[PDB]
Write an enzyme that holds these catalytic residues in place. Structure first.
Site, PDB file in Angstrom:
ATOM      1  CG  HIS A 122       1.934  -2.744  -2.057  1.00 23.48           C
ATOM      2  ND1 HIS A 122       2.176  -2.762  -3.407  1.00 23.48           N
ATOM      3  CD2 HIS A 122       3.116  -2.917  -1.426  1.00 23.48           C
ATOM      4  CE1 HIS A 122       3.470  -2.930  -3.579  1.00 23.48           C
ATOM      5  NE2 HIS A 122       4.054  -3.021  -2.398  1.00 23.48           N
ATOM      6  CG  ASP A 176      -0.243  -1.769  -5.508  1.00 25.66           C
ATOM      7  OD1 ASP A 176      -0.335  -0.810  -4.712  1.00 25.66           O
ATOM      8  OD2 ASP A 176       0.475  -2.743  -5.228  1.00 25.66           O
ATOM      9  N   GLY A 194      10.976  -3.583  -0.725  1.00 22.02           N
ATOM     10  CA  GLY A 194      11.658  -2.321  -0.412  1.00 22.02           C
ATOM     11  C   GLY A 194      11.815  -1.505  -1.702  1.00 22.02           C
ATOM     12  CB  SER A 214       7.165  -1.969  -2.887  1.00 26.66           C
ATOM     13  OG  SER A 214       7.806  -3.185  -2.620  1.00 26.66           O
ATOM     14  N   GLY A 215       6.647   0.403  -5.010  1.00 26.42           N
ATOM     15  CA  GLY A 215       6.076   1.748  -5.225  1.00 26.42           C
ATOM     16  C   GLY A 215       7.034   2.605  -6.040  1.00 26.42           C
TER      17      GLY A 215
END
Ligand SMILES: [Ca+2]
Ligand SMILES: [Ca+2]
Lengths: 223, 223
Positions: free
Chosen positions: B40, B84, B175, B177-178
């Site tokens: 994402h 994801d 923020g 994320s990942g």
């Protein structure tokens, strides 16, 4: 906007989106060549987008125009957010029409209890972040200064007004900043700040535009 | 990171910031030329920044490197966020050192109850948005799948794990994320999603990396 509703397409024609490769703030069109926003929305290069509904889809009413002069209030205090107002002169006049129109400056300060309209592409959640595609709208009253001050002990200056609900659930949020608070057809506030978003006892705080008409006029005239 | 603490400078050396003119996602350095992030977080052009502490200040340990190949999981489902995971091959190898180091892939899936470390420059508030300058850290346990599923009826696949606290107050946020979830020195999760941030009964959901080591290896080898 948290807890608002999707505005009818092009029903808030003075609403603009400030863009830097992404939408980061809203503003209001006060004349075919000037936009009023928040000083905290300052950026050295900005593309102003008018006639928007769906921020991510070209719908055919958009006017995209670069900011020529960005003028923050000389007294903007980055720390307290006192005098959080900015003027953007566009590189060229926009085509006024049904979806791209002006909002009037206030003839007087609005009394507590007046119903206003707030709009934006700001965050729609009370927790976490969700950026909407369609412009959101919120009907909300201007609260008595006593309620405002009470909610934010020692931070409200007379250049600030609270708009919203003490119960929470409905409010402006990040990304709605610099956007309009229109009451009885006049711009009475600019989305400024609040603690969290849509939280009980933490109404949104707005720049009180009726304190700046002189400044706005002077500046437009001198530039 | 909501409710975390400021990491000791360069103490999470595998942590990277994905940049597009602004920080938008984190990732982990798994080898001198590859970064693991969330699908994402995909963008067509990304600058990977390593050795960061203060995201807004050049401190002298930074390595800035463009992504050469961005490979999203072939089965990423944008709707459910199943699979994801994404791999970024950097345009050139980084200089491994004390502040720029690799994190190991998991030898096995971690049991519920293991204590992990989550880090990022993600939002620090449970309501509203606040982007920090310094990398934030959070110590939190992997929760039993039963707790995860219970919190998010019908949405957790076996490629997802919950990490956090049922009480709320502490969590990853937008923020982050990942970014990484490291347990006993191995990457066990990728910051994925949750309802709100740091809310009671809504633990953060993470991609279960132990389900992808094969894929990660195959891909690195084939590219
Ligand atoms: Ca549009
Ligand atoms: Ca730095």
């Amino acid at each position: 906007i948290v807890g608002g509703y999707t505005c009818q397409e092009n029903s808030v024609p003075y609403q603009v989106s400030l863009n830097s490769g992404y939408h980061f703030c809203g503003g209001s069109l006060i004349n075919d060549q000037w936009v009023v926003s928040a000083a905290h929305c300052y950026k050295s290069r900005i593309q102003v987008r008018l006639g928007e509904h769906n921020i991510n889809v070209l719908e055919g009413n958009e006017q995209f125009v670069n900011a020529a002069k960005i003028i923050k209030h000389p007294n903007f205090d980055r720390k307290t957010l006192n005098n959080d107002i900015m003027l953007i002169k566009l590189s060229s006049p926009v085509k006024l029409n049904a979806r791209v129109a002006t909002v009037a400056l206030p003839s007087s300060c609005a009394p507590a209890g007046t119903q206003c309209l707030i709009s934006g592409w700001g965050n729609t959640l009370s927790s976490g972040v969700n950026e909407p595609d369609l412009l959101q709208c919120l009907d909300a009253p201007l609260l008595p200064q006593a309620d405002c001050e009470a909610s934010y002990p020692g931070k409200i200056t007379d250049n600030m007004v609270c708009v919203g609900f003490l119960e929470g659930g409905k409010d402006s949020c990040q990304g709605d900043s610099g956007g309009p608070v229109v009451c009885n057809g006049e711009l009475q506030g600019i989305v400024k700040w609040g603690y969290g978003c849509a939280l009980p006892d933490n109404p949104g705080v707005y720049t009180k535009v009726c304190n700046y008409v002189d400044w706005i006029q002077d500046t437009i005239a001198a530039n």
